[PDB]
Symmetry: C3
């Protein structure tokens, strides 16, 4: 399993929720943020989306996010992929890929 961190323009949150639903993804945690980078130190409002996903889905999610969110204007955002050693569902104590099931 992998962690995705998706940092976007807030207006693009609906489209990120749809991309993850369209790949069977079970859930997501959304944080408000301020970001700085190339867009013109100017801070701008951002949404930071965290989702845990099965390893075979990551490549298609990254392609989907570029194809559907790109505006060709500076500031569209970033996606990173990082490793997960253990995942647990609090309600059941289930570990591994069972912890992300649709139920």
């Amino acid at each position: 399993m992998k962690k995705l961190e998706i940092t976007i323009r807030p207006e693009n949150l609906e489209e990120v929720k749809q991309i993850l639903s369209d790949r069977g993804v079970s859930g997501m945690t959304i944080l408000s943020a301020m970001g700085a980078g190339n867009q013109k130190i100017n801070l701008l409002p951002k949404i930071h989306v965290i989702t845990y996903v099965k390893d075979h889905l990551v490549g298609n999610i990254l392609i989907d996010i570029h194809e559907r969110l790109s505006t060709g204007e500076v500031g569209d955002g970033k996606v990173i992929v990082s490793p997960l050693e253990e995942v647990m569902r609090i309600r059941t104590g289930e570990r591994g890929e069972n912890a992300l099931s649709a139920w």
Copy 2:
């Protein structure tokens, strides 16, 4: 050392602080969030807790969180475990497990 990310119902924050104190954990950083998943895309309020811990404590913290927070109702939340390559205390410049000491 490992990073835990604990995503919970906000009413359960007091019990997460007590579980970490009961395992000698030095600290925690708390973020407000909105989450989507199985509970009935409906966004619901969540707390996202980050804590850095010694590797031998992770198994007992995961057991404690399942045993004390489970309600057997959908939406109790998730815990993940991920790797840490370096940890530094800003005040002293100390690295490694010394950076998390109680002082």
Copy 3:
């Protein structure tokens, strides 16, 4: 590439932005938080800064943060370093170190 998580007193955010600019770092995402630890469970306001950086810069950024932010008073904060498997720029679809370029 590596992820840094920098958890600080809010008054120190200007100095963290300057340290990252002084090492050529392209950007940063800023989250408001509450933290608990050694400082006197008392919750205190914090800023949580996430930045993605090239591996050869991490050692000098950690030294800079200790030298410029240390007050020798408990509560100055923490820096962690964690691994990144993939980085993508949404606007272009570019991966790897190209995804963090100044443009």
